[PDB]
């Protein structure tokens, strides 16, 4: 869970991003010019909102560096790509204002936008709304009724849909409108990678509260057993040392 240097040891491919952020930290002129990837700075409010941002933002942009101004991308971007194969994102001057305010969004059964459910640097979060377009995707922790889903599927009379991607509870639905034919609309409901659609239940208590934390605990118990083995061995060597002291 720690969005820090420790998260870079989980995957082998993350070593390049680790070396990149390290060399960025060493260079004093690079930290203020190129900030940390959104996986480090941008953090959600809780664990439920963290999985929502991971579904929209791909794995490449989450570990990609940020280039605030276009001046550094012409002379200081080449020393990064030659040694490390990491993605680079340049901050653009595109507007980050949503088409509709948060008032009408709350009237549709949503709590708010995805940009309001994450905390971090302003320059890093600005590109998450321009690349992944999270500032135009309503996010709600409660699953909405399929009737309201079909109402949101129906586009506006002007010929443009209200939203392109909506998030109700945990199911993610992509609203795509056909540009040819009779302008037919069709939903694409995908499941965000997480446990299940529970709401404050016992959280899938088959035999233990977790499935990998039990592996962690058994590994820690093995470490405890070997530490007690080391304890008894050094106690035996100390007893032998006391015997040698009696011999002296």
């Amino acid at each position: 869970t720690t969005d820090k240097i420790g998260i870079l040891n989980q995957d082998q491919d993350l070593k390049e991003v680790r070396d990149a952020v390290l060399m960025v930290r060493e260079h004093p002129e690079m930290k203020d010019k190129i900030l940390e990837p959104p996986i480090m700075t941008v953090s959600a409010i809780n664990a439920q909102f963290a999985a929502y941002l991971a579904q929209c933002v791909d794995y490449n942009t989450s570990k990609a560096l940020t280039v605030v101004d276009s001046d550094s991308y012409k002379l200081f971007a080449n020393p990064i790509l030659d040694k490390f194969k990491v993605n680079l994102r340049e901050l653009s001057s595109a507007d980050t204002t949503p088409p509709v305010p948060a008032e009408t969004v709350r009237d549709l059964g949503f709590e708010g936008y995805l940009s309001d459910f994450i905390t971090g640097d302003k320059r890093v979060m600005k590109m998450l709304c321009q690349t992944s377009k999270i500032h135009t995707i309503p996010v709600s922790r409660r699953e909405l009724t399929p009737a309201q889903i079909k109402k949101l599927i129906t586009p506006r009379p002007n010929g443009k849909i209200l939203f392109k991607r909506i998030i109700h509870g945990n199911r993610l639905v992509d609203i795509k409108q056909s540009a040819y034919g009779s302008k037919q609309v069709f939903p694409t409901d995908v499941s965000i990678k997480q446990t299940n659609f529970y709401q404050g239940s016992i959280m899938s208590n088959e035999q233990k509260i977790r499935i990998e934390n039990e592996i962690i605990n058994l590994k820690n118990e093995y470490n405890d057993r070997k530490s007690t083995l080391d304890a008894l061995s050094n106690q035996k060597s100390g007893y032998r040392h006391e015997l040698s002291e009696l011999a002296s």
Partner: protein, 289 residues
């Protein structure tokens, strides 16, 4: 070893029980197929839909992995027109015991014209690279994954330049870096490295003995590419080998120093053992005094 499995995925149990080439999940695909074939009587629309219905066109066997990586969202989809049939397919899948997540997308089967929105250029598109059994499935794929706006360019720089030239009715381009990963460029500035899936979800027209055997040798060259990787580190492995040689030499030097300290202790013992043992014969000097 996965690449070694990529060598065995083509001739181990293909077309009968291959849980890595055709069966993307537990042994229930044929079960669900027989179930829907025998219970289509209660379905108002046939739920025959999308991986098996799409076949790779000839001359683009190297783009199959890229097409799969791009349209995996629709390769595991079905064709259902009514929400009642949606729930029916759902509970049938739950009863037949399918553990893999099978997404569903509702759509009314109807053919239309999409030639006005196809990709403009001299490069072949996914539509020309894909063979569809029915035009309805082709129209559904065009509406879902916009395959008519994606081109196929082998060179990465060429595809990047073509995307930067602002092409008409083109959103993204596919590139072939190797047989394990691919380059998916969008807009000519966003470069993303995607990994090809190990399990294939697309049918190939050529046989598994002659047309595919040539592609099997390409996988063997990928093992040599990984053999180059493991041999590139062998030069780095020589560094840690020399390092462990140096540390065992230092261990031998410390053992020699320990032996020298033992010799020093023994000679100090033999020196101090004869200090005041018997040389206290002072009778002569007492007589002298």
């Amino acid at each position: 070893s996965r690449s070694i499995q990529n060598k065995k995925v083509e001739l181990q149990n293909i077309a009968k029980g291959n849980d890595t080439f055709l069966m993307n999940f537990d042994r229930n695909m044929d079960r669900l197929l027989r179930t829907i074939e025998q219970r289509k009587n209660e379905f108002e629309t046939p739920a025959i839909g999308l991986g098996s219905l799409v076949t790779i066109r000839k001359g683009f066997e190297k783009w199959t992995r890229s097409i799969q990586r791009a349209i995996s969202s629709s390769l595991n989809a079905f064709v259902v027109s009514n929400p009642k049939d949606n729930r029916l397919f759902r509970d049938i899948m739950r009863s037949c015991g399918i553990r893999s997540n099978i997404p569903i997308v509702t759509y009314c089967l109807s053919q239309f014209d999409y030639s006005k929105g196809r990709a403009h250029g001299n490069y072949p598109t996914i539509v020309d690279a894909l063979e569809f059994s029915k035009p309805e499935i082709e129209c559904l794929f065009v509406d879902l994954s916009r395959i008519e706006r994606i081109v196929l360019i082998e060179d990465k720089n060429e595809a990047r330049n073509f995307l930067q030239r602002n092409p008409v009715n083109v959103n993204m381009a596919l590139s072939l870096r190797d047989r394990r990963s691919g380059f998916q460029l969008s807009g000519g500035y966003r470069l993303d490295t995607v990994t090809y899936q190990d399990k294939i979800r697309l049918k190939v027209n050529s046989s598994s003995d002659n047309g595919t055997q040539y592609l099997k040798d390409l996988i063997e060259q990928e093992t040599k590419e990984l053999q180059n990787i493991r041999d590139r580190y062998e030069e780095k492995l020589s560094e840690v080998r020399s390092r462990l040689k140096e540390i065992d030499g230092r261990l031998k030097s410390t053992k020699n120093e320990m032996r020298k300290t033992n010799f020093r202790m023994t000679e100090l013992k033999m020196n101090v053992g004869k200090v005041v043992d018997t040389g206290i014969l002072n009778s002569k000097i007492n007589e002298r005094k």
